[PDB]
Structure formats: structure tokens, C-alpha cells
Design a protein around this ligand. Sequence first.
Ligand SMILES: CC(=O)c1cc[nH]n1
Ligand SMILES: CC(=O)c1cc[nH]n1
Ligand SMILES: CC(=O)c1cc[nH]n1
Ligand SMILES: CC(=O)c1cc[nH]n1
Length: 147
Amino acid sequence: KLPPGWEKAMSRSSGRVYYFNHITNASQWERPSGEPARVRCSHLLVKHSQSRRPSSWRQEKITRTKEEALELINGYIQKIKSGEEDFESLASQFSDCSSAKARGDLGAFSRGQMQKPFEDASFALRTGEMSGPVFTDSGIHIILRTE
Ligand SMILES: CC(=O)c1cc[nH]n1
Ligand SMILES: CC(=O)c1cc[nH]n1
Ligand SMILES: CC(=O)c1cc[nH]n1
Ligand SMILES: CC(=O)c1cc[nH]n1
């Protein structure tokens, strides 16, 4: 029917169908468009107190809770989707991963190299698509597939 991971869902507030991807946590009103050995992705990471390494170039000690990190991620998604900001601009300014200095680019990778949730979300994205929140041992990510 739909591309991998995508399902129809019902909007509580509106009563209209929407589309949800349980691999990427993407959601959208529009029916999705239309696997490679490698993908290239950029990401924005928000760390929290339980991150594998709760420290970053932004903050020597990261003290926010997981719930606070998810709210930050949700806010960044809203700003990107509204057109207020672009993905890589927010990654350069606010990502807790050292890749922030390269607009969040992680380069190209195959299956079997990244943390599995990150990998699975990345390979279910099409070029130009963004994930919803992706949870790993590093923290909470949003992912942009660039190639
Ligand atoms: C160990 C734990 O609760 C957690 C939640 C996210 N990352 N780690
Ligand atoms: C799973 C996780 O990190 C989280 C934080 C808030 N809700 N869920
Ligand atoms: C460039 C950018 O912000 C974006 C978000 C989704 N796809 N691209
Ligand atoms: C393995 C690695 O560096 C990774 C996984 C998700 N993000 N970064």
C-alpha cells in the first residue's frame, strides 16, 4: 500500500485521516510519495541527564530531563515545519552532537554502523524527508536524509 513504515491514522482533534510512520515517527496530512546500500543524513541531537555521555560542546554538564529534551525536539520540529527555521541552521546552533559544526552532517553510511534506531529511521526516509523524534542512547534526534 504505502511505503515502508507508513500507516493511516485518525486525527483526534479534526477527525481527518493522516499518515504516520512508526519507524521514523514522521506524521503528516498528505499521503506519502512513492532500499539503497547507503544513505547520507544530517541530525540534530538533544541530550539529557541519562544520555550515554551527558556533556556536549554546548554544556559541560547536561542536566535537562528526557521529557525536557523531547519538548525541545518537538519545538524544533514545529519551527522547521512552520518555515520559521531550517533544519541545518537549528542543528548548527543547538545540536548537542559535535557534528553541529558541520550543520549536523554525519556523512554516508550503511546498515550496521549507527545506533539501530537512528539507522532504521534513516533508511526509511526518502531524500528530502525529515524524521520525528528518534530515541537512542545518545539522546533524542531529528534526522534529515540528504542523499
Ligand atoms: C536509562 C534510561 O532511563 C534512559 C532513557 C533514555 N536513555 N536512557
Ligand atoms: C522515551 C523518552 O526519552 C521520553 C521522554 C519523554 N517521553 N519519552
Ligand atoms: C531543509 C529542511 O529544513 C528540511 C526539512 C525537511 N526536509 N528538508
Ligand atoms: C554510531 C553513532 O555515532 C550514531 C548513531 C546515531 N547517531 N550517531
